Design a protein around this ligand. Structure first.
Ligand SMILES: NC(=O)C1=CN([C@@H]2O[C@H](COP(=O)(O)OP(=O)(O)OC[C@H]3O[C@@H](n4cnc5c(N)ncnc54)[C@H](OP(=O)(O)O)[C@@H]3O)[C@@H](O)[C@H]2O)C=CC1
Ligand SMILES: [Zn+2]
Lengths: 125, 114, 134, 146, 95, 341, 86, 207
């Protein structure tokens, strides 16, 4: 037999996270920008959730990068913006959502390179 | 919003399980101090138990309450059966953590953490 | 001297020439004892018994919204109107145009590389200036 | 390529003037107290601030609120904008109201007293894009820069 | 070569040396600072330039498959030598 | 600040406190707590030791990798002191001994050595200097230990005028020679006391309080050049204190009166031991000395430490002195001691 | 304790800001002529409730909702601020 | 039979497909999906209400006889509203065959305990509760099994950090092991490894 529970989903007290890392963090929900060094677009398909960067310092012995932020490497993947937002809400994280950036559709034409009277005529091939 | 319950049909039934757990913990503190040979008093132990229940007083979902109670009973059983060691019982008191002042200026002086 | 954070070391709001507000993100933390710039002013206000009413980045951005609500509309270009009224008021007082020709501060590439404090401290920007002047 | 300026000439500690008049490292507690003492002793037009070019809005409003609370209104920027008429009352008076992407829809552009190539290189690139693809006509009042 | 700072601490081939006032040099008191003495930048300079009769020479570091990936070096500029990007050996085109 | 000593982190084991501290006498009761608290927050600790390296092993787990550094030193070799302090920003002197030995007398460990450490530290540019004296230090004291503390405390304040001098009462803790000393009197049956302990008053202080006071003195600019007195929250009659010790340990308490000359004679009896004397004539004197009241000096509350009552920590020290029958007895089972209001 | 600054927030297209849009269209020029040295910052933003903010000496601010006000009501809300100073 | 390519086995593919729809015909009340992979593994995806009826049928039916529970585990997929996928891997000795039964649940919905069907499931469900926080109803003895006593959180969830939140050391002052907030001398270095070029067109999702 089912029951009715109309309140919002809030699992912050049964996830075991320290309170500091719930209420002081800022999740960013975004689709990663394409790496401009490459033309492939396969890494701009899914939504990502990451957290705000915190202090890294140099280890006195070696000079390694030390951190005290347990969430420094936490990155989650979501199919849609709604999935990511819903996950952030139930875990108690404040968040910013950045709208997906899709490349504009362009009008390409090989013929324009040899225009009779336009500036698109190319001086070299 | 029709969901399968865990134990409690509504908050009224859940708060009954909460009170039952609180009694069990409250009676158990005197044995825990004695058995684990802790250097704290029964008053401190019961104040700590009270502080643990209080942090969750704002919940209104019966399913969440049920899971908190389930974990509370698991925690109590670990203590009663001396599966926990003294180090585990004392981790609730964070005796080695230095104070971390919680006012804007104090944090500003020490670092970038909000 | 109060050491503040550079644009790479804070989540801070900037408005471009369109009026489009955008925010940076913390890439690294400020060096040494440097601190987030708005926190320095908030900390000073408390020491001087004049505490500003915002303790977090979210709250100070609420304060921004109370002064200009477009400053929290990130990535949005907010239209502005009433050019007619601005032109009407621009006629009330007449001022003389000087005879000096319009000469921009930067006329060639060598003037482009060092314009702010960061680029002036850049050793790479110094290499570029040397390259285009020798 | 200017990011390498972020590893040089950095301010890393608060400084105050010592008894010989030279800047010396000090704590945040000491530095802010010397500032607060002066701020508590001045009012109105005796306190002013100047914001530089790379200043974020959060610091700008925090500084304004602090100076207003000593009844100061001399919050200035280094970059001038004429205050005659509407001044800064109307955003349209000091904005690029056509927006950057709008350059692609213009058929004429008049540049007055500017060198967009170096002042806004990406904006100038947008103009050349429209010059190339939409046969935009461009005229300039000012020095004949390339 | 391995120099010493005005404090006496040896300077590594990467130019590292604790400065006068860096507490971290206490770790060497009663012990020593490990510093390799054979600086590879000086050793590779000792090698003589090799004279070849072709515009393009190949290098694999020597030893066949015990060397580095084989690369081809252009020797058209006379103002300088071609340098192997892996092993640093230098080549020049004779007249 | 030199870039290498700007604090970083969240005050934990892998953080950077900015403190570079040479701790002389780190291998004793007070040393292990001071070194523990420095290493907790990622300080660099230099530990010059006279002892065998086996006896410093308990200090090794106290700091992250590279943060505890050990050197050899000799209290009479001024060069060895220079090597240990020349890189530090603060020097802490915990050196001391409760008995004289063939090689070192109270003047050596409480005057000559503290003076030499302070002198080398000053010449080396060391900025902070914390020196532990004693609450009951007095040039007129009947104890050579307390007379040398008064002299050494004067010489330290002259060599290093900006030193912080801390004057603790008798310190109680797990490895103390205080509560443990009284509890160990049980092997002789009755508990001798001069005038049955009704003429003496003590104000003992918890070890952790002294430790936290030392650590705050390092970080507190106001602490430079000052002299503090670290005392517990309560004053007790020596008779009531020892009675409480035997109650907490559940051992039979059979106090009897012993006059001063008799107690002194036995003190010499135990001084014959070439090892660590169980008691001495000097030790008997200090235990029966009244703890001075010094309202003019700042105290633990001035450094932010809230003194810990003996009633809350006695079981922690004295539980191991019970038999199997009474091991599990809880803290509240024993009624406290009358505190001199 | 005088008046230091006025800010008017409104939407460019919502019907709730129509009265504020009319006031700026018809009366802002004359209002500015009477107070040349008074900053009157108009800041439009999409889908905001119109409000009139007034800043007084020492950073005291009060705000008045202008939602659904007519142009005449906007003139009174501003007249009360420019006169009933505080 | 190209030497570097794994050979297909269509006979096994056919047999498992036929049995897949056999199970779907018999338990339509609970079966939501049946699929056979290109390397011949059969999966039955069911409604969580069907855990006991479906597992009982596969164990006891004369044409199934999946007597052995090889493995019981969970997978966390945060993008799903029911983020936890519960996976039963069963073995049939009689028919020398394997089958996978999958269902789902969220953080707050109990799953019926399968100990009545397979006594092997006891510890597997304790592990799932410990590492994922999925509650199993009517478990004779549900409690942590792998994590430390008093451990907070469920480490195998995708939003639990790799190094956790606390670490242990020995403290001389309190003379015991203590737990403190985690600090790393060297932070784990996240690598971004995925190539921006698609690898497998056969699996491309529609845009
Ligand atoms: N009740 C108390 O404990 C009180 C103590 N104090 C003072 O606090 C300081 C330390 O207290 P505590 O730690 O209890 O004393 P401990 O005897 O417990 O430790 C003494 C330290 O001094 C070192 N030391 C002793 N003699 C020499 C020497 N001749 N040459 C070199 N090092 C030496 C010891 O090193 P090793 O391990 O090599 O012997 C040890 O590390 C002392 O100055 C003491 O007077 C003050 C008030 C009360
Ligand atoms: Zn080579």
């Amino acid at each position: 037999q089912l029951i009715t529970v109309d309140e919002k989903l809030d699992i912050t007290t049964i996830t075991g996270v320290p309170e500091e890392h719930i209420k002081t963090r800022k999740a960013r929900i975004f689709v990663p920008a394409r790496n401009n060094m490459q033309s492939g677009v396969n890494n701009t398909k899914k939504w990502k959730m990451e957290f705000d960067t915190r202090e890294r310092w140099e280890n006195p012995l070696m000079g390694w990068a030390s951190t005290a932020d347990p969430l420094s490497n936490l990155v989650l993947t979501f199919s849609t913006k709604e999935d990511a937002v819903a996950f952030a809400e139930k875990n108690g994280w404040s968040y910013d959502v950045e709208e997906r950036k899709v490349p504009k559709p362009k009008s390409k034409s090989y013929g324009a390179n040899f225009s009779w009277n336009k500036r698109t005529r190319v001086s070299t091939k | 919003t029709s969901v399968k319950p865990i134990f409690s049909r509504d908050m009224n039934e859940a708060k009954r399980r909460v009170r039952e757990l609180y009694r069990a913990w409250y009676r158990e503190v005197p044995n825990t101090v004695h058995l684990f040979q802790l250097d704290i008093s029964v008053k401190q132990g019961r104040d700590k138990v009270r502080e643990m229940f209080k942090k969750n007083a704002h919940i209104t979902d019966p399913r969440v309450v049920d899971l908190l109670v389930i974990k509370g009973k698991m925690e109590l059983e670990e203590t009663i059966k001396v599966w926990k060691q003294r180090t585990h019982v004392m981790r609730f008191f964070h005796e080695t953590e230095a104070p971390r002042p919680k006012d804007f200026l104090s944090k500003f002086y020490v670092g970038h953490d909000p | 001297i109060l050491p503040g954070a550079a644009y790479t070391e804070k989540s801070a709001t900037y408005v471009n020439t369109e009026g489009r507000a955008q925010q940076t993100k913390v890439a690294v933390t400020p060096p040494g004892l440097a601190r987030e710039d708005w926190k320095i002013i908030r900390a000073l206000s408390e020491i001087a018994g004049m505490t500003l009413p915002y303790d977090t980045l979210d709250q100070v951005r609420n304060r921004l919204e109370e002064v200009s609500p477009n400053l929290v509309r990130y990535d949005d270009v907010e239209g502005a109107n009433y050019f007619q009224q601005a032109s009407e008021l621009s006629k009330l007082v007449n001022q003389q145009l000087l005879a000096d020709p319009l000469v921009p501060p930067q006329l060639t590439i060598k003037d482009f590389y060092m314009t702010d404090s960061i680029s002036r401290a850049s050793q790479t920007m110094a290499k570029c200036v040397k390259a285009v002047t020798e | 390529f200017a990011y390498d300026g972020l590893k040089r000439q950095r301010l890393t500690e608060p400084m105050v003037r010592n008894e010989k008049g030279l800047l010396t490292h000090t704590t945040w507690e000491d530095a802010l107290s010397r500032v607060a003492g002066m701020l508590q002793s001045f009012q109105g037009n005796d306190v002013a601030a100047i914001a530089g070019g790379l200043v974020d809005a959060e610091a700008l409003i925090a500084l304004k609120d602090l100076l207003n609370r000593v009844d100061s209104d001399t919050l200035c920027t280094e970059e001038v904008f004429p205050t005659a008429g509407a001044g800064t009352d109307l955003r349209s008076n000091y904005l690029l109201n056509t927006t950057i992407a709008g350059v692609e829809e213009a058929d004429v552009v008049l540049l007055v007293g500017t060198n967009p190539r170096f002042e806004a290189p990406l904006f100038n690139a947008r103009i050349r894009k429209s010059w190339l693809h939409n046969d935009l006509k461009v005229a300039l009042i000012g020095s004949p820069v390339d | 070569g391995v120099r010493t700072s005005p404090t006496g601490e040896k300077v590594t081939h990467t130019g590292q040396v604790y400065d006068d006032g860096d507490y971290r040099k206490v770790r060497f008191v009663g012990r020593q600072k490990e510093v390799n003495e054979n600086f590879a930048i000086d050793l590779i300079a000792e090698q003589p330039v090799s004279q070849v009769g072709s515009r393009v020479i190949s290098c694999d570091g020597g030893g066949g498959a015990l060397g580095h990936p084989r690369v081809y070096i252009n020797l058209d500029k006379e103002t300088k030598t071609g340098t192997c990007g892996y092993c640093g050996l230098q080549f020049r085109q004779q007249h | 600040l030199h870039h290498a000593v700007i604090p970083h982190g969240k005050g934990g084991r892998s953080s950077v406190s900015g403190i570079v501290a040479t701790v002389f006498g780190a291998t004793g009761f007070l040393g292990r707590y001071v070194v523990n608290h420095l290493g907790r927050m990622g300080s660099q600790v230099i530990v010059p030791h006279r002892c065998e390296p086996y006896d410093t092993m308990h200090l090794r787990p106290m700091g992250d990798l590279g943060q505890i550094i050990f050197m050899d030193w000799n209290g009479r070799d001024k060069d060895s002191i220079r090597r240990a302090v020349e890189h530090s920003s603060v020097v802490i002197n915990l050196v001391g001994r409760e008995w004289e030995t063939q090689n070192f007398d109270f003047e050596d460990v409480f005057v000559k050595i503290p003076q030499a450490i302070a002198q080398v530290s000053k010449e080396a540019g060391v900025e902070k200097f914390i020196h532990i004296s004693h609450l009951n230090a007095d040039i007129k004291s009947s104890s050579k230990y307390l007379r040398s503390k008064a002299v050494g405390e004067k010489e330290v304040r002259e060599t290093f005028p900006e030193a912080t001098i801390i004057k603790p009462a008798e310190i109680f803790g797990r490895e103390d020679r205080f509560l443990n000393y009284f509890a160990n009197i049980r092997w002789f049956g009755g508990v001798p006391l001069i005038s049955l302990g009704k003429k003496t008053v003590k104000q003992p202080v918890y070890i952790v309080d002294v430790t936290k006071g030392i650590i705050n003195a390092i970080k507190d600019p106001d602490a430079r050049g000052k002299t503090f007195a670290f005392v517990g929250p309560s004053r007790y009659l020596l008779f009531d204190l020892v009675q409480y010790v035997f109650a907490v340990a559940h051992r039979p308490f059979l106090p009897y009166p012993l006059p001063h000359f008799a107690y002194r004679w036995i003190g010499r009896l135990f001084e014959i031991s070439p090892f660590e004397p169980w008691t001495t004539r000097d030790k008997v004197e200090r235990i029966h000395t009244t703890d001075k009241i010094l309202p003019h000096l700042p105290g633990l509350e001035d450094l932010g430490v809230e003194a810990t009552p003996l009633e809350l920590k006695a079981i922690e020290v004295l539980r191991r002195h019970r038999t199997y029958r009474w091991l599990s007895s809880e803290i509240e089972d024993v009624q406290p001691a009358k505190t001199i209001p | 304790l005088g008046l230091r600054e006025i800010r008017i927030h409104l939407c460019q297209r919502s019907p709730g800001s129509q009265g504020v849009r009319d006031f700026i269209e018809k009366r802002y020029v004359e209002l500015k002529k009477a107070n040349p040295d008074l900053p009157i910052l108009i800041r439009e933003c999409s889908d905001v409730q119109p409000k009139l903010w007034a800043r007084y000496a020492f950073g005291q601010e009060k705000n008045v909702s202008l939602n659904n006000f007519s142009a005449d009501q906007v003139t009174r809300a501003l007249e009360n601020v420019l006169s009933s100073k505080a | 039979t190209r030497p570097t390519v794994r050979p297909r086995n269509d006979v096994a593919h056919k047999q498992l497909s036929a049995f897949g729809e056999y199970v779907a015909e018999i338990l339509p009340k609970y079966v939501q999906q049946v699929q056979v992979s290109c390397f011949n593994e059969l999966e039955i995806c069911i409604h969580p209400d069907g855990v006991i009826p479906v597992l009982t049928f596969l164990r006891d039916h004369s044409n199934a006889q999946f007597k052995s529970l090889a493995d019981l585990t969970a997978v966390d997929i945060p993008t799903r509203q029911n983020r936890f996928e519960i996976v039963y891997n069963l073995l049939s000795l009689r028919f020398n065959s394997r089958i996978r039964v999958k269902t789902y649940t969220d953080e707050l919905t109990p799953i019926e305990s399968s100990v009545p069907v397979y006594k092997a499931a006891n510890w597997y469900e304790r592990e799932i509760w410990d590492m994922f926080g999925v509650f199993f109803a009517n478990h004779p003895d549900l409690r942590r099994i792998l994590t430390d006593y008093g451990f907070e959180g469920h480490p195998f969830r995708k939003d639990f950090p790799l190094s956790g939140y606390v670490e242990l050391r020995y403290d001389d002052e309190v003379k015991r092991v203590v737990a403190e907030p985690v600090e790393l001398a060297q932070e784990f270095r996240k690598f971004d490894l995925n190539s921006p070029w698609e690898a497998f067109p056969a699996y491309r999702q529609p845009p």
